[PDB]
Amino acid sequence: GSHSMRYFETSVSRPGLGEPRFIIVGYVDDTQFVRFDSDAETPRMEPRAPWMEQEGPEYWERETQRAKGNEQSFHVSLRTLLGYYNQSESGSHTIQWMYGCKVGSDGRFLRGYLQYAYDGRDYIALNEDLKTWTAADVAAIITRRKWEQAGAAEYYRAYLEAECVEWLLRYLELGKETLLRTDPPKTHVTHHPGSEGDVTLRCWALGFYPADITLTWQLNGTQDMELVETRPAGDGTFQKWASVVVPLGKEQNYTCHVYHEGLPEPLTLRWE
């Protein structure tokens, strides 16, 4: 088993009508636990998970102070990055920041990620060593040289390797029956008739946690397959399906394979 914490901080510059929009979205494994929005009536760190309400008022005030502090930090960073690329003030730009740590079944630290983005493209990222930075362009090298003297790489390393792991293990304890749970997928194969003398077979997988699943179609063993992205049901479970164009009569010749951590053995499915 493996569990990971992820914080998604986004800053969207609004030209003329803002006051840029700042959103913080937190995730533990595949479930949302914290939320922050500058456009909200009362800008404060809100719980999205019911088990997160157990945390005291001192924690929420501390996370709001961090979020409000980051809001003005990204606001200054938006104007700084505007000067780095020498772009017009009339245009709208976005800064994305995702960070967190991944722990094993021990459960101790495996990898720490801390990456930045400007207008949906890579800007600066902290390497796997958690001591060096990788700059995408010449404007990002200015940020790297500024963070080398300031010692940002060593500062973030102190969090990702220690403070991140410490809190991730705490959130797993708070949501013991919500995060550590594993629901097996409800699988069934559906038949769809065609007009070109061929039928479409769909291998369904509904109601499962976590989202990590791999659906494959086998004949005697892949490229001809039509797999869709894992979609959330809304109630707390996920959905995913694979489709193949197969000839009429050979409905039982094609077998589907489901790979999920909730299942003790990989399932074999056929149309009936």
């Binding site: 939320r35 999205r48 207008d119 493209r121 992205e229 959905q239 399906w241």
Partner: protein
Amino acid sequence: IQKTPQIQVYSRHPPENGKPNILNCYVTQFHPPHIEIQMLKNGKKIPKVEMSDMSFSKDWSFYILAHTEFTPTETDTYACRVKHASMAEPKTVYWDRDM
């Protein structure tokens, strides 16, 4: 930089006529994040539509989900119209019971 969104219209539980269900509009892989998602029931927009907090994956592409309660019928048509900067005309993806 601009990314065209990929819309997925589906139900929370398997579709059954008359039974109350929840329709989900999953708008995936898009940039800029400024987007206008509208859930429709036979042309006209659905009244109470609740949206989720906008998030993004490792490839920096944005993800958002819109859900509302609905009663599926053999005649009733459900579609999700999405308005984004990357598209000149707003794309309307119709709900399929088989997808």
